């Protein structure tokens, strides 16, 4: 049960920490693809 | 064997037999539930048959199958149905699973019930069976009798019923543990719970569990209180204190306090303790000037200088006309911050020639820095450069105005208001740049001291000074006004600010408003979101811009992932870089409390097509670890210290150096390079006064206040935030925008002082308490735990850590009640044996104070 | 982003005044290399700081 | 660019003026602003879409041959490309996608019409 | 020697010591690797007299000697914990008929290994360090019974075992409590294939596949293997084969290809029969009968014609071999199917043929059963024709179209749906170096 409460809990941060990224990517994806153009 | 015989038995009559069926079936369900899995509808009908008793058998039987079906709420429900067929102490993994499986389900319900009601658990809404079994497991957790186990559950179980009782029951004051078990969850609670109220509920009871006082830890309660910001508690304490009344007990509590409660909050207790009757020492601890003294005393003592190298920098160029010549106006101030020295100031009198009216102004502001914490002289220091003593430049004359409160922030309100009067004097008129600066420099220093002090006038008088639309003056207004209402502030300003923002026509005047918004949107979090959204909704950076800071000052420290997440994509997506950059920067605030992944985080943005990204990176990262480690985080930035744009690395220089004070020398070897790289750059003529600037600054950063002072926010010493610690950065954030800024950075400057002090009025008996650390007071600029006597513990370098491998000697006259509280700056060996040896020591305080 | 920046990077470089290939005729102690530009005549001219 | 070559002091540059003889390019720092208003009216660049879009360039099939042949030609280029697997770019597994990927979409958009 | 024997196991335990401090991937795959190299040393003369002495000492080590049963005498709580368990792993290894014959001795030992201090705390800790095969691989042998009076009672130790595996199926909590599992099923499956009727396999289905990744494709195929045989008399053919098609495709087996994959292939061969497809055994000429195909070929050989007698003759001939593989149940059907197959072919190629000329094939065979027999055939489609006896005209359809329909584009869609196979997989593995290179 417990030290997880300490331990376990902290890892949804990672869950989140994971989560953010694709977002950045999709942007970045688009970012290239829009930047890619004038190139 | 096979249950078709049982599936035979199923609908076969004689509930007796069917009893027997179930029973018999039940024993062999384990294998044949599969076969049985089909008859569950009948089994369900069975459980629907009250006529036949055992059908909970069928229910639990079904539950078993349901496990073997993966059906759990099914199983749980029919485990719930059983209660009899089921027992917790029946041990099957399945049971112990559905045992578990039940437990969880409670929480969300409870959470969803906690959602609506916070006494929900006191009520029936949750299946009692669950809640029962839940608490019966809590019982089992109580029987586990390591109740953290129970706690984290009941934490999410949201039952203080559980918690408090389990506490009080188990309160035997495990003396310190029943204190700490609280803290274990309490400190955890700080980290855990969404709803602070829940946790706020904790902090009170805890305090009261502690107010049971088999001498509870007060600093515990302090931050607890400080997190609650509840005067009564402190007063209750103070009473309870006055009941217990002891100098060191009061002092340390006030030392707890003076380290902790907001300037704003604090004045309540001040007023309170005043009205309470009191110990004036406490009221004198409310000065904190003793520290300012001690700090200066420390500084003046413990300053480590090498202005020669600084001179070497100052001699490395006079140029950019002012702009680089400006940097050194500051880096010197760093080393001299609070240390009150003209060392180089005289070294160039032709300095002023190369100073520019703003640098002339700026150089003037550089003083209050140098004199910071000198609660008289600094004014007298500015006196010659005060208005009416004229100056060479009105802006020089203006610099004092701002430069003043640098020392007096929070304490110069009068002079401030006085200046405000002078402001108010020139407020509605006098568009003279000279006046404007005079206004502005005052319009600077006003909110400076007035920061955290809510005076509409501050806001107001500026509001028109603002509205007077001097990009010079009204800019500072856009700040001081915020500084005034920095806090939740008022929405009407917000309207008006936001109004003025779009309304008022100027870049910066419009801009800085965002700050004041962010200022007066502070900790508000969910509050400003609208304006945030509005700021988000801004076509312009400036609103969006500040929104990040707003979200920061809202969510700074504690991560709101979503906020962050918003902030990210917002930054990520947005057109304007500096938005991103700043937004990126603003991250490290809501991200402050965990610097941890920030490198891993900014690692994403360590790479970018865009410098500003990679610019924005450096700070937020350099912020979170400023008072921290992670060469990792550092070394991330070293290529970015080479990122082609000096401006980029200029940050990275600074950004790292923000981390890197006190950390140097084979503790951290690379500092030399870093310092060299500065010097490298600083020597490099083709490195910019972007680079050299930041370098010289970043250098002097590492060197600020005689390099012996530190940079702290959300201070683990207290555990508590310092808004002021924040501000200087945020202030300085825009600079190459508005150069006359950084002096704000002096805020987080923090002493490493270790000085005997007393748990009484201070004979300053000094001793080096000598418990060994691998020696990083010996790792530090030229120009682990052995539990062995450390060499020398008295002031200088120390470290928060190198503090904490050292411990006191009991053998001196004076002893702390807190068993080496662990914080160099806070000092205060508590006074056990006065009017005796342990001699006497004094300070410039003791001189004048 | 590897590409992205990198791709973008070239665009910068895709903007040039130029790089004159030139015929160094000689130097002097002046640290102005005495150089005939290929089509042009000689110009005694400072060098790249790295050369 | 915009020059105006002299300062007050500076952002206050300073010296060469009082030392006299200020000459240089000396740009200023440009910017500009308009609005989201014309932005629309701008981005209005590219009745309308329906008339402008789907349906207005649903013309494909006219080229199906090419649309084939274009796709057809992709094929050859690649056996080629793949082959080299047996250095630097033209690489055996590069233009492959960028080639067979350009005729994939443009060929799917037409389906919207039918 | 025994030293080197021990030395190897020292390395094993040394690699067990890897896992001991949180490091399986090494250990397990090493243990996996070790399992193969285990054949080398083998035995247990001084390996154990030196093992039971090298490690430490525990009651169970004593009760283990009851399995050892010998005499040495001679002279000569942490490290000796899971090693001992990991050696209990090797204990099972000592049971292979490697270092054993009658594991019915070891049967109880297995339990007495399995059940005590084991099958206890191991959920995520032991990572399939259980080998329930090598658990049961023991019992697998003894199920040569016959003799046992099955088992005990009937046969409860296996029923127990099933329930014990069931007792794991609980323990399959999917805490990662998986890998070994559906062997349990596979056992139970083959237990069905021993006696039971699989269909609770549907429940076994209903649970899971051996989720997921780290399971041996072997089992994962062996999964399919029986799982094929589900559809066998479940009379799904493709999926059955698809299993095979997902079994032999990439199951990794050469040594075990030998007797064991033949089995697969056998049913696999049996598949196309189910569909009457008769691929060219022209390959199944090879690595086959010898001991597997050729009756299938004979079947095919028959099924090529599907000449009931000549068909039956094979069966008549090979029934026991069929019976040996219990593919006998099959083919009893495809008999007339191929008859109907021929009926369809080089025959329906007129828009008819008559009643009687198509009845001629039945005038070759039967009459006005034709009606049935043709309806029997038409019933299934599997042909497309009509008749009118009122016409006496057995009217044999086109089967003629173009790709005007979405039929191709179905396959395109089929292809489309696959567009994510390797495409989405590329991302499935994109990680590994890319992510581990960060490390």
Smallest CA–CA distance from D13 into chain B, residue: B321
Q: E86 and E109 in contact (C-beta within 8 Å)?
A: no
> Residue B63: its chain E contacts at CB < 8 A?
none
How far is residue D10's CA from residue D14's CA, in Å, rounded to a whole number?
Answer: 6
Q: Which of B313, B369, B305 is nearest to B693 (CA)?
A: B313
Structure tokens at B264: 């704003």
Is A2 in Cβ contact with B149 (below 8 Å)?
Answer: yes
| Chain E: closest CA distance from residue B32 (Å) | 9
Spell out a b/e string for D73-102, using b for 16 or more CB atoms within 10 Å of the CB, else e.
ebeeebeebeeeeeeeeeebeebbeebeee
Q: CA-nearest residue of chain A to B573?
A: A27
Task: Say if residues B652 and B765 touch (Cβ distance below 8 Å).
Answer: no
Q: Chain E: nearest CA to B67, how far in angstroms?
A: 8
Contact B607 C8 (CB under 8 A): no
- Which residue among A17, A24, A35 places its CB closest to the CB of B572? A24
Spatial distance between the Cα atoms of D76 and E101, rounded to a whole number of angstroms = 64
Of B321, B539, B739, the CB nearest to D13: B321
Cβ(B313)–Cβ(B331) below 8 Å: yes
Name the residue in chain E with its Cα closest to that of B37.
Answer: E203
Contacts of B190 in chain A (CB under 8 A): none
Q: Rounded to an integer, what distance in angstroms lies between the CA atom of residue E74 and that of residue B261?
A: 76
Is residue E9 within 8 Å of E112, Cβ to Cβ? no
Q: What per-residue string of b and e applies to B441-466 under the rule 16 or more CB within 10 Å gives b? A: bbbbbbbbbbbbbbbebbbbbbbebb
A-chain residue closest to C5, CA distance = A32
Max CA separation in chain C (angstroms): 47
Nearest C-alpha neighbor of B567 from the set B611, B529, B615, B609 = B529
Q: Is the dihedral of CA E112, E117, E121, E126 positive or negative?
A: negative
Judge: B568–A23 Cβ closer than 8 Å, yes or no: yes
**Which residues in B21-55 are b (16+ Cβ under 10 Å) and which e?**
bbeebbebbbbbbbbbbbbbebbbebbeeeebebb
Chains A and E touch (3+ CB pairs under 8 A): no
What is each CA distance from E393 to B460, B758, E396, E422, in whole angstroms?
Answer: 105, 119, 9, 52
What DSSP state is assigned to residue E290? T
- Cβ-Cβ contacts under 8 Å, B689 against chain D: none
Of C4, C10, C11, the CB nearest to A32: C4
CB count within 10 Å of CB D52 equals 11
**Cα–Cα distance list, E154 to C39, E149, E150 (Å):** 105, 8, 5
Tell me if the bond preceding E161 is cis, omega within 30° of 0: no
Structural domain range at position D54? 47-114
Residues of A in contact with C8 (CB under 8 A): 35, 39
B–C CB contacts, 8 A cutoff, strictly below: 9
User: Which chain B residue's Cα is nearest to A30?
Assistant: B573
Q: How many residues does chain A have?
A: 39
The answer to whether C22 and C35 are in contact (CB under 8 A) is: yes
Residues of B in contact with D10 (CB under 8 A): 321-322, 356
Q: Does A31 touch chain B (CB under 8 A)?
A: yes
Instruction: Check if A35 contacts C (Cβ < 8 Å).
Output: yes
Pair type for strands C42-46 and E353-354: unpaired
Is the CB of C8 inside 8 Å of chain A's CB atoms?
A: yes
- Cα–Cα separations (whole angstroms), residue E399 to E352, E374, E385, E396, E404: 12, 17, 9, 9, 14
Beta-carbon contacts of residue B494 (< 8 Å; ≥ 6 apart):
B517, B520, B521, B528, B531
Residue E189 near chain B (CB below 8 Å): no
CB atoms within 10 A of CB E77: 7
Give the DSSP per-residue string, B426-491. HHTS---HHHHHHHHHHHHHHHHHHTT---HHHHHHHHHHHHTT-TTHHHHHHHHHHHHH-SS--H
Dist. CA B410–CA B287, nearest whole Å: 11
Nearest to B93 among E159, E170, E207 (CB): E170
- Residue C32 sits at the chain A interface (C-beta within 8 Å): no
Q: To what resolution in angstroms was this structure determined? A: 4.8
User: Given B1, B30, B97, which is nearest E173 (Cβ)?
Assistant: B97
Phi and psi at B271, nearest 5°, equal -50, -45
- Neighbouring chains of B at 3+ CB pairs under 8 Å are A, C, D, E
Contacts of C11 in chain A (CB under 8 A): 38-39
- Separation in Å, CA of D39 to nearest CA in chain B: 11
Q: By the CB < 8 Å criterion, does C15 face chain A?
A: no
Closest by Cα among B312, B314, B231, B317 to B274: B231
**Which tokens hold the place of B134?**
């839940």
């Amino acid at each position: 049960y417990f030290k997880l409460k300490k331990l376990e809990k902290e890892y949804e941060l990672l869950t989140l920490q994971e989560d953010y990224i694709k977002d950045e990517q999709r942007h970045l994806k688009r970012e290239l693809k829009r930047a890619q153009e004038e190139v | 064997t096979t249950a078709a015989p049982l599936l035979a038995l199923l609908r076969e009559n004689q509930d007796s037999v069917k009893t027997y069926a179930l029973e018999s079936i039940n024993n062999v369900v384990d294998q044949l539930w599969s076969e049985i899995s089909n008859e569950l509808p009948d089994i369900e009908a069975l459980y629907d048959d009250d006529t036949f008793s055992d059908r909970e058998m069928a229910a639990l039987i079904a539950s078993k199958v349901y496990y073997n079906l993966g059906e759990y709420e099914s199983a749980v429900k029919y485990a719930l149905a059983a209660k009899d067929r089921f027992d917790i102490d029946e041990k099957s993994q399945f049971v112990e699973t559905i045992v578990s499986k039940s437990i969880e389900m409670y929480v969300q319900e409870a959470s969803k019930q906690y959602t609506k009601d916070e006494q929900f658990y006191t009520k029936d809404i949750i299946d009692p069976k669950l809640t029962s079994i839940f608490e019966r497991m809590i019982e089992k957790c109580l029987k586990a009798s390591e109740l953290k186990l129970a706690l984290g559950i009941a934490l999410e179980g949201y039952r203080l019923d559980i918690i408090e009782s389990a506490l009080k029951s188990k309160l035997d004051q495990s003396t310190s543990e029943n204190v700490k078990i609280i803290n274990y969850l309490l400190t955890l609670a700080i980290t855990t719970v969404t709803n602070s109220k829940f946790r706020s509920s904790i902090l009170r009871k805890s305090f009261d569990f502690l107010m049971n006082m088999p001498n509870c830890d007060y600093l515990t309660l302090n931050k607890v209180v400080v997190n609650l910001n509840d005067a009564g508690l402190a007063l209750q304490l103070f009473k309870k204190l006055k009941e217990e009344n002891d100098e060191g007990l009061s002092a340390q509590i006030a030392f707890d306090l003076v380290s902790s409660a907001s300037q704003q909050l604090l004045e309540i207790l001040v007023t309170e303790l005043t009205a309470q009757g009191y110990d004036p020492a406490l009221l004198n601890i409310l000065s904190g000037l003793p520290t300012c003294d001690y700090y200066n005393t420390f500084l003046l003592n413990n300053k480590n200088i090498d202005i020669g190298l600084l001179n070497k920098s100052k001699s490395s160029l006079d140029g950019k006309f002012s702009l680089f010549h400006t940097a050194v106006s500051v880096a010197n101030g760093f080393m001299h911050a609070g240390t009150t020295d003209n060392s180089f100031i005289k070294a160039n009198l032709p300095w002023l020639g190369k100073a520019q009216n703003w640098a002339k102004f700026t150089a003037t502001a550089s003083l209050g820095v140098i004199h910071k914490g000198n609660l008289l002289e600094g004014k007298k220091v500015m006196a010659p450069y005060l208005p009416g003593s004229r100056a060479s430049s009105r802006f020089i004359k203006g610099g004092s105005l701002y430069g003043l409160g640098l020392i007096y922030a929070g304490f110069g309100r009068d002079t401030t208001d006085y200046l405000k009067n002078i402001i108010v004097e020139n407020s509605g008129t006098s568009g003279d740049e000279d006046v404007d600066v005079l206004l502005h420099g005052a319009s600077l220093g006003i909110g400076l001291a007035a920061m955290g002090s809510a005076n509409i006038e501050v806001y107001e008088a500026l509001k028109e000074v603002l509205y007077n639309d001097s990009a010079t003056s009204g800019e500072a207004a856009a700040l001081g006004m915020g500084l005034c209402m920095l806090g939740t502030g008022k929405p009407e300003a917000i309207h008006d600010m936001f109004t003025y923002s779009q309304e008022t026509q100027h870049g910066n005047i419009t801009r800085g408003l965002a700050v004041g918004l962010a200022l007066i949107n502070y900790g508000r979090q969910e509050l400003a979101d609208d304006l945030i959204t509005k700021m988000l909704a801004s076509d312009e950076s400036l609103l969006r811009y500040g929104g990040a800071f707003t979200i920061a000052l809202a969510y700074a420290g504690t991560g709101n992932n979503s906020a962050v997440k918003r902030l990210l994509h917002v930054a990520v997506s947005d057109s304007n870089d500096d938005v991103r950059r700043a937004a990126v920067i603003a991250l490290g605030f809501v991200l402050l409390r965990d610097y941890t992944t920030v490198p891993r985080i900014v690692q994403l943005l360590s790479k970018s097509h865009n410098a500003h990204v990679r610019c924005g990176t450096a700070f937020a990262l350099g912020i979170a670890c400023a008072g921290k480690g992670l060469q990792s985080a550092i070394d991330v930035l070293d290529p970015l210290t080479k990122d082609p744009v000096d401006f980029v690395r200029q940050a990275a220089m600074i950004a790292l150096s923000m981390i890197l004070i006190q950390q140097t020398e084979k503790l951290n070897p690379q500092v030399a390079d870093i310092n060299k790289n500065f010097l490298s750059v600083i020597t490099n003529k083709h490195q910019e006064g972007l680079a050299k600037f930041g370098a010289c600054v970043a250098q002097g950063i590492m060197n600020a206040g005689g390099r012996n002072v530190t940079i702290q926010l959300e201070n683990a010493d207290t555990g508590t935030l310092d808004t002021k610690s924040v501000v200087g950065l945020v202030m300085f954030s825009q600079f190459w925008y508005w150069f006359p800024l950084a002096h704000f950075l002096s805020l987080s400057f923090t002493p490493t002082t270790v000085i005997g002090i007393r748990g009484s009025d201070q004979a300053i008996p000094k001793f080096q308490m000598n418990c060994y650390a691998k020696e990083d007071a010996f790792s530090y600029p030229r120009m682990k735990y052995s539990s062995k006597p450390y060499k020398v513990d008295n002031m200088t370098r120390i470290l928060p850590q190198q503090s904490r491998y050292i411990s006191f000697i009991k053998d001196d006259r004076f002893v702390p009640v807190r068993k080496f509280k662990g914080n160099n700056g806070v000092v205060v060996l508590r006074d056990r044996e006065p009017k005796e040896p342990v001699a006497l020591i004094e300070t410039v305080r003791q001189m004048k104070d | 982003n590897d590409k992205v920046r990198f791709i973008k990077d070239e665009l910068r470089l895709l903007q040039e005044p130029g790089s004159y290939v030139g015929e160094v005729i000689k130097i002097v102690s002046d640290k102005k290399v005495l150089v005939k530009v290929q089509p042009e005549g000689k110009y005694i001219v400072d060098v790249a700081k790295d050369i | 660019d915009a020059f105006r070559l002299i300062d007050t002091g500076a952002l206050i540059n300073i010296q060469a003026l009082i030392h006299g003889l200020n000459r240089h390019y000396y740009s200023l720092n440009i910017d500009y602003h308009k609005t989201a208003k014309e932005t629309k009216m701008l981005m209005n660049l590219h009745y309308e879409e329906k008339e402008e879009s789907n349906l207005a360039a649903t013309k494909s099939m006219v080229k199906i041959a090419e649309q084939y042949s274009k796709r057809i030609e992709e094929e050859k280029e690649l056996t080629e490309e793949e082959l080299k697997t047996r250095v630097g770019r033209q690489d055996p597994k590069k233009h492959l996608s960028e080639t067979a990927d350009e005729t994939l979409e443009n060929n799917i958009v037409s389906v919207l019409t039918a | 020697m025994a030293s080197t024997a021990v030395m190897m196991d020292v390395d094993s335990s040394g690699v067990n010591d890897l896992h001991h401090s949180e490091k399986k991937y090494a250990e397990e795959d090493q243990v996996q690797e070790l399992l193969k190299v285990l054949n080398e040393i083998s035995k247990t003369t001084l390996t154990l007299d030196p093992r039971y002495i090298w490690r430490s000492l525990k009651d169970l080590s004593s009760l283990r000697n009851q399995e050892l049963l010998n005499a040495e005498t001679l002279c000569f709580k942490t490290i000796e914990v899971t090693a001992e368990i990991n050696c209990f792993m090797h204990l099972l290894v000592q049971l292979f008929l490697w270092d054993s014959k009658e594991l019915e001795q070891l049967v109880e030992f297995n339990r007495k290994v399995v059940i005590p201090n084991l099958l206890c705390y191991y959920n995520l800790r032991s990572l399939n360090l259980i080998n329930a095969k090598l658990w049961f691989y023991i019992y697998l042998s003894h199920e040569t019974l016959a003799r046992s009076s099955e088992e005990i009672n009937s046969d409860n130790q296996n029923i127990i075992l099933r329930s014990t595996m069931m007792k794991f199926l609980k323990i399959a909590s999917l805490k990662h409590d998986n890998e070994t599992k559906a062997m349990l099923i596979n056992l139970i499956l083959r237990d069905f294939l021993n006696n039971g009727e699989v269909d609770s396999a549907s429940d076994f289905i209903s649970k899971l596949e051996y989720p997921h990744t780290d399971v041996s494709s072997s089992l994962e195929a062996r999964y399919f293997f029986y799982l094929s045989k589900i559809n066998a008399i479940q009379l799904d053919y493709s999926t059955a084969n698809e299993y095979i098609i997902a079994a032999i495709r990439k199951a990794p087996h050469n040594s075990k290809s030998l007797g064991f994959l033949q089995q697969s292939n056998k049913l696999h061969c049996c598949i196309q029969l189910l569909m009457g497809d008769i691929p060219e055994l022209s390959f199944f000429h090879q690595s086959n009968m010898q001991k597997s195909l050729l009756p299938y070929y004979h079947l095919t050989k028959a099924v090529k014609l599907g000449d009931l007698k000549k068909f039956t003759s094979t069966i008549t001939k090979y029934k026991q071999l069929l019976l040996k593989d219990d593919t006998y149940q099959l083919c009893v059907r495809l008999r007339s199917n191929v008859i109907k197959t021929g009926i369809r072919i080089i025959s329906l190629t007129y828009k008819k043929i008559s009643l009687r000329d198509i009845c001629l094939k039945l005038n070759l065979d039967s009459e006005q059963t034709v009606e049935y027999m043709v309806s029997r055939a038409i019933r299934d489609g599997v042909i497309e024709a009509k008749i009118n006896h009122e016409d006496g005209f057995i009217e044999t359809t086109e089967l003629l179209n173009i790709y005007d329909s979405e039929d191709p584009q179905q396959v395109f869609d089929e292809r489309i749906k696959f567009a994510n196979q390797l495409h989405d997989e590329y991302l499935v593995s994109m990680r590994y170096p890319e992510d581990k290179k960060t490390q």
